[PDB]
Symmetry: D4
Subunit: 217 residues, 8 copies
Amino acid sequence: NKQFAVIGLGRFGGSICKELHRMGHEVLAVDINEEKVNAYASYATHAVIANATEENELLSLGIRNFEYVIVAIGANIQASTLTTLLLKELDIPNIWVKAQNYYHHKVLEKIGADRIIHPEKDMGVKIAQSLSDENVLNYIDLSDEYSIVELLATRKLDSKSIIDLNVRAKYGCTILAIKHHGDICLSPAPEDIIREQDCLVIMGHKKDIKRFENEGM
Amino acid sequence: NKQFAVIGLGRFGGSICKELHRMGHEVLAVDINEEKVNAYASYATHAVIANATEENELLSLGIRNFEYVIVAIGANIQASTLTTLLLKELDIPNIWVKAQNYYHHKVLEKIGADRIIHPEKDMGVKIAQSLSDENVLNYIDLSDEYSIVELLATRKLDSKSIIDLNVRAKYGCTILAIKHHGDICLSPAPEDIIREQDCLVIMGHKKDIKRFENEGM
Amino acid sequence: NKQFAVIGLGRFGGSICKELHRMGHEVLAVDINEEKVNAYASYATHAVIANATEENELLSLGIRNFEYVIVAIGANIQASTLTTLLLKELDIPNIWVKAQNYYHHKVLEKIGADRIIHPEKDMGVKIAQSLSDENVLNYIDLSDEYSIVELLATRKLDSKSIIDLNVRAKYGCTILAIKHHGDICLSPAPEDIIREQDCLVIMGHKKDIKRFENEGM
Amino acid sequence: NKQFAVIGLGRFGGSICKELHRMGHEVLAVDINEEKVNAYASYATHAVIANATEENELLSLGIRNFEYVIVAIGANIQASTLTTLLLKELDIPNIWVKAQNYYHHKVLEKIGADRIIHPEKDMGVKIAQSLSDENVLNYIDLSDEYSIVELLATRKLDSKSIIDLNVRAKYGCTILAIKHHGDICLSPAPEDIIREQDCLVIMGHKKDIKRFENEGM
Amino acid sequence: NKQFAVIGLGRFGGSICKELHRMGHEVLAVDINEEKVNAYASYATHAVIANATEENELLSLGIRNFEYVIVAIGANIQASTLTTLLLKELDIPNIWVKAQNYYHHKVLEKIGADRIIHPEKDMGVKIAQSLSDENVLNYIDLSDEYSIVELLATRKLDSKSIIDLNVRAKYGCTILAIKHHGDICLSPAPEDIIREQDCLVIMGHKKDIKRFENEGM
Amino acid sequence: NKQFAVIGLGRFGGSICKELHRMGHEVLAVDINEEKVNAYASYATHAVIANATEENELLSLGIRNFEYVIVAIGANIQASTLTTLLLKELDIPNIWVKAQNYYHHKVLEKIGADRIIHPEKDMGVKIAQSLSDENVLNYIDLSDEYSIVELLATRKLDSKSIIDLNVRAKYGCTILAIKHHGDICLSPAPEDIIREQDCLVIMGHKKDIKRFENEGM
Amino acid sequence: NKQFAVIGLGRFGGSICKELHRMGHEVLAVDINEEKVNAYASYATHAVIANATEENELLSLGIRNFEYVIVAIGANIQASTLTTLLLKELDIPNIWVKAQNYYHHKVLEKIGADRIIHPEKDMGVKIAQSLSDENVLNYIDLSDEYSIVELLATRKLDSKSIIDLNVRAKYGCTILAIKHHGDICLSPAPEDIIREQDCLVIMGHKKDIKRFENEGM
Amino acid sequence: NKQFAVIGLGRFGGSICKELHRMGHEVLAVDINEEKVNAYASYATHAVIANATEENELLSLGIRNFEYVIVAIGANIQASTLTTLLLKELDIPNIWVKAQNYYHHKVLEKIGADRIIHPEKDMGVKIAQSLSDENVLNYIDLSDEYSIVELLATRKLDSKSIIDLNVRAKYGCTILAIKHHGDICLSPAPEDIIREQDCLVIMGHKKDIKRFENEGM
Ligand SMILES: Nc1ncnc2c1ncn2[C@@H]1O[C@H](COP(=O)(O)OP(=O)(O)OP(=O)(O)O)[C@@H](O)[C@H]1O
Ligand SMILES: Nc1ncnc2c1ncn2[C@@H]1O[C@H](COP(=O)(O)OP(=O)(O)OP(=O)(O)O)[C@@H](O)[C@H]1O
Ligand SMILES: Nc1ncnc2c1ncn2[C@@H]1O[C@H](COP(=O)(O)OP(=O)(O)OP(=O)(O)O)[C@@H](O)[C@H]1O
Ligand SMILES: Nc1ncnc2c1ncn2[C@@H]1O[C@H](COP(=O)(O)OP(=O)(O)OP(=O)(O)O)[C@@H](O)[C@H]1O
Ligand SMILES: Nc1ncnc2c1ncn2[C@@H]1O[C@H](COP(=O)(O)OP(=O)(O)OP(=O)(O)O)[C@@H](O)[C@H]1O
Ligand SMILES: Nc1ncnc2c1ncn2[C@@H]1O[C@H](COP(=O)(O)OP(=O)(O)OP(=O)(O)O)[C@@H](O)[C@H]1O
Ligand SMILES: Nc1ncnc2c1ncn2[C@@H]1O[C@H](COP(=O)(O)OP(=O)(O)OP(=O)(O)O)[C@@H](O)[C@H]1O
Ligand SMILES: Nc1ncnc2c1ncn2[C@@H]1O[C@H](COP(=O)(O)OP(=O)(O)OP(=O)(O)O)[C@@H](O)[C@H]1O
Ligand SMILES: [Tl+]
Ligand SMILES: [Tl+]
Ligand SMILES: [Tl+]
Ligand SMILES: [Tl+]
């Protein structure tokens, strides 16, 4: 009976609701706009036109029965703050709120939001990382110094090997997976071959990976 | 270094500009809102007020001299499409546009945009995956079936060494890194232990990682 | 069962719909404005209030059954582009779209519009031709050099003949029809007479016709 | 040369101004929108920002010195009517106004406009005639019953000479010109042949031309 | 069966309708505003919410049955012109239209309005006449030189007579009525007495009356 | 001469200002609309742009120096009331305000306005009286029962002398003046005749004048 | 059957209505906004959506039966003036109106409002008094010179007495009540003790109390 | 003296500023409306136009140098909250904010506002208490049960001495002061008399004061 409410159907909120309902979960789409409700109705377990700033409508949805509530309102700062304050004063266990600027994050922190999300800023940082380094496809920072990076193998790495491309001693990183033509190899053996336009999953220090990219690739 | 031009300062494009200049690149912050230009003036090389949909203002910016142009406008579909068409007529090597819906992405496809980004949608998918599983902190999908996952250790995981939790054979997964008290052990040994409320990096097929989440932690 | 849909009731679109329904054809008038629908209802086979940007309403009209669809929306550029993209992605054979500027024409070209029309620009060119040359009433350009021109015969041509006004040798043109008091003569004999304020249909090079106008008329 | 004044730069009036100056005439581009004046400044002799409905601004323009004044305003009915009345009070020899509906045309009639144009309506009639008959490319109506038509040749017409297709006696029409590969044969001979996807100019009564379209091609 | 229609309920139009219905006449109040119709309903024989610019609604009121129609719309110039043109083209015998400026009067003249009224301008002239001459209460100009004037008798005229105040020879005017305490005397005898604050009805040349006011009063 | 200040240039107040300056008085044209100030600048002594509801701007105008202040604002009830209150606080001898409805007149009464004018209402009463009786041209009501009336002569009145139409005894009225072909006979003799389409001035009780209109003409 | 009407639900008006209905009185909440009526419905004896500027709706509420009527409209000056004038002309005994500025107070005075209230100005004065004097909690001015003041006893007054803190002779004031930990003592005996952070109710001249605060506290 | 900064000039904050400067303090009048800054410029030391929600403008004002900051904005909830958060981040010792509703007060609580004021609510409570009891003029509540009350004397109270009205024993209350004809007797004697229409200060429990109001007056 785990329940998720998504207040504020937008790109972020609509994506959250659609992805949660695709997973086989109970989601209630809530938006003050009738058209947004009609849009995301077929992608949720329930869809109600409600003004989340209103305590009466909030109670009428059965908001108390939801373990998780996600306020994806990000453009209207005062509406998002009102919804978050109402949800806290109604004792919702987990409130995840989308922020707009740093002060919105501060005021959502002070009123007790469980998690505050900055989607656009994070994706902008990631896309900038992919912009300066045209090799990287995706990545994940384990810490401020260590990261796992997926990379497009260049012509310089075409038909090379795991011992021919030695990184555990020449650059300090290790190689974790290789994707060729759609088939993936995990924990690759020292004999495995990397080809041009393959996907390489390296892991180590940021500067180590960049050393490998400048010198190796 | 590299010639970047971020048209459309916003939460996404502004983050791109800020991070790319912290990276030390020539980033031209283009906006029509004077307050937007002033907000990111301290973070860019040149911050010019201009309407990108105007050909005269675009030639005034010298936008043909830039190798990378990023149209982060995603709310004004017409303005974004017009700017992308103007840049494609100007033979820009790389055009990266932010899209709003499927049809905006389609019209950006037809007019020759090089890379179309949907930040809010993908980040909402990620946050929904974190909502359905409170254990996962971050992840990267190698393919539609294989992934690397960051997890938060639980009471069922405290003082459990890597040899007690055989993931190499019980689930076909591999533990990649442990993070304890801000320090990090990369490629940990079978005798290394894990304490609760730590960051655990595992690699393998999605259902196998979920199997470990269910049975082990 | 040939079917024409006219989306965007306006001067151009309303004229297209009224002229097609006068011809004894099946036309569906579609406009987002209830008043425009009520206006052009009595001049069409069917009239429905629909938002053409909406895929659901577009499917509800039975848009798939129309062989020809005419998007006469010209002022709202983004709405016209959305309607055209939807009609293409719904596999409409012939899409005829009214344009507003040269970039609207380009974006309608890139998304696959079958025909793009610039009514106002064309009629402005024609009216300018009638403005500088007060003699011409209507015309048609066969090529960039040859044209057929209807002209008001001046007093200088009153009670003149086809051999008295020789143009097949004196100016290189030929005379094709003469309209006197409402009666018309085609392929006129060499003995036919032109009178003042008659309609003369000459045909030949533009400069040849202008020679005849300066010298003959 | 000739004194023209295009009040109301738009798709229609702007085309008039552009073409008339490519023709090399003194064309005064009058508009109230500064951006409209700047858009057509490179194509006119003088492009002044002015409100035509104001008598003081109209005397400032020296509009009484112009033989031809064209009020292309068709969306603001009141402004167009007021401008036409102001010009008629100023004894302008030729006033040509763009109209929107039947009643705007009637009030332009009553206040003494010399020529009223309905561009979109007539062009929509033409495009509707081209929609009902895909063969016709352009046409000019000599009278309500007689016309000259440009047609696109079909497979039924390839390698057919002018004597095989007797239009002079079988249908009472006459072929006027053939256009093949951008070259053009004017007043073609009976032994001249026509290939498919060519431009064919025929002349005659409307029903007779349609008879040839049905039976021949 | 004499019938009056009042289109445009306002101060002027509402006053016309209320005064006509007080007289025991058939009046139809017509206004596009539901509140104005509800207001002037109880003061008319009928009240209908109608958009007079619409020919269909105009016909639905039975506008053809009205001998007199008064378009009191004065602020919306284009709406008043449209209503007047419609009423003329529907062959209304008498059309009385309220004007706003001199050009509105001209355009209503050209489209065939039977009477054009300038209420505010006329009353402003009258109030200015009462302003400069504090003696005058009301008046009526018989011609540009002769007028009948009602005046407040001053202390200088208190307890004076018709032969004591001789005006048929001393100033060229005659005295026509005297109102004392509410009782009025017409064609007053030479023995009648004027008292302070009485109402005097003099008649003659403007300069003659002003002579009498400067010298006599 | 006299110190007048017309606050609120409009159709009423603008007429007051224009006529009063044609009369040669010091008329201060006060308005908040710059175009309104410019429109009546050529007709006044001083035309200042000012907001009358502001005490500082009112003391800047030197409005305490004026003996007569006319607030012609009748659409903005609040602004007119505030201006009247500001002038009454400034001890203006004569304040004449234009009113919109009964309640605006009441609040102008309570705050001490000297004279309240309802131009449109009274002029609509006059025009309604002219509509019910096409014979009357103008009139002045001496009392609720007695009046002077200007009439248009009919066929029943042509070549009728003043002794044939005994109004002195048959109806208790008196003919005051005749107007023929722009010339005027004042206080006409019993042998003076009247032709049709002339201006006839009669004086007497309302019902008696109507009796003559019915029986004589 | 004493009855209170509250027109203008706002902070001030809503507080008046809620406090009057808490007291066990008959209150009718009246607001032109449906949401305000729904809000203050559960806190009143009746709640009706009405436009108080309308005489018909005002009569429909039964406004004649209310002995007290409170116009809490303060932002819309003209609406408040209209409501007050209507209530006076309907002979309401007691009209209490909320004012906005000094001129609104003047115009409400002139139209006969029984009481005019300036809540925000009064509370601003009180809060300024508490701002400069951080000791005072609340007070009440008996006259422009004498006042009763509640004060927070400082550390300088901790464990002091009524004869140890002598004010009837040392500063001219008297002590009236002492509040310790929630228990209050009225007309305190000469032996009573004041403690730190207690509430002291002194009474006397303003300068006397300030002497005591500077010297004693 | 003391450093005050009133952000948000309004009826409340403007009164605070005016009174505090009449008190002779350094009061910085901060507003975004230029007319608001000009309105209170004559009553403050410095009156700067600034947007308080902007960090740059706030550091430009030198707001960190002020010991007391009063955000009187109560209609714009977002702007007030943002300003309060900006000041709390700047370590202002005393922040006093004006609130609109319970939730605005709650968010001001969470972000660390020192004192939150609800002027209209409390003043409406006071005016409601004065409406239910016409005798009370002002009052101060010592506790939820004890209060000091100012009353207006009635006919039942004229010529009644303090010993005839034993409030010390009949009701447990005490008369504190009498006010007659603008003069005031403080701490009056048992033989002092009271006349009607005087100001009487009584002290005691609420129900006891009401008992005296019922039985005595
Ligand atoms: N009080 C409210 N109650 C319910 N829904 C609301 C309320 N206020 C706004 N919304 C809706 O929540 C959604 C949030 O979208 P909004 O445009 O405000 O933010 P955004 O940051 O641009 O969104 P995103 O990037 O997630 O698409 C909108 O669909 C909006 O209509
Ligand atoms: N010519 C232009 N046309 C449109 N937007 C422009 C233009 N020049 C600059 N911009 C900026 O582009 C930005 C992108 O628009 P907007 O912020 O409405 O869209 P969004 O994609 O929803 O934003 P975000 O990604 O920040 O959430 C705006 O901040 C706008 O000021
Ligand atoms: N999404 C839509 N769906 C349906 N009809 C639409 C839509 N958007 C606009 N329309 C209608 O289509 C018509 C197009 O007129 P519009 O004023 O936009 O263009 P225009 O270039 O001025 O027209 P024209 O010259 O043909 O009269 C209008 O009646 C408009 O209301
Ligand atoms: N005084 C004026 N009054 C009205 N329009 C004016 C005036 N001066 C210039 N104009 C221009 O006249 C043009 C005609 O108006 P508009 O474009 O709305 O009408 P339209 O006939 O539908 O246009 P188009 O023929 O270009 O489709 C506008 O672009 C406007 O800027
Ligand atoms: N098309 C229309 N059909 C019917 N009524 C209309 C139409 N357009 C306007 N009206 C109404 O006619 C009335 C004319 O008032 P308007 O304010 O336009 O003129 P005005 O000169 O200020 O009036 P007045 O001085 O007579 O009060 C208004 O009540 C308006 O709502
Ligand atoms: N401070 C002011 N407040 C209001 N109106 C002002 C002010 N200063 C000047 N005016 C002018 O007063 C005029 C009177 O207002 P408006 O024309 O709307 O009313 P009206 O009585 O219906 O007009 P009219 O009598 O001309 O028909 C306006 O033209 C306005 O520009
Ligand atoms: N004509 C009317 N009839 C009834 N209610 C009205 C009318 N006009 C305004 N109101 C309502 O009266 C209330 C007065 O609030 P308003 O915002 O106008 O004043 P305010 O001074 O800001 O109020 P406050 O400080 O008391 O909250 C509002 O709820 C408004 O909707
Ligand atoms: N940055 C700012 N944000 C918001 N308001 C500001 C700002 N700077 C100045 N102000 C002023 O703060 C004032 C408070 O807002 P407003 O008057 O709408 O609220 P209110 O609490 O209902 O008012 P009042 O207490 O006077 O009745 C406004 O007059 C506004 O001009
Ligand atoms: Tl966004
Ligand atoms: Tl057009
Ligand atoms: Tl008016
Ligand atoms: Tl307030």
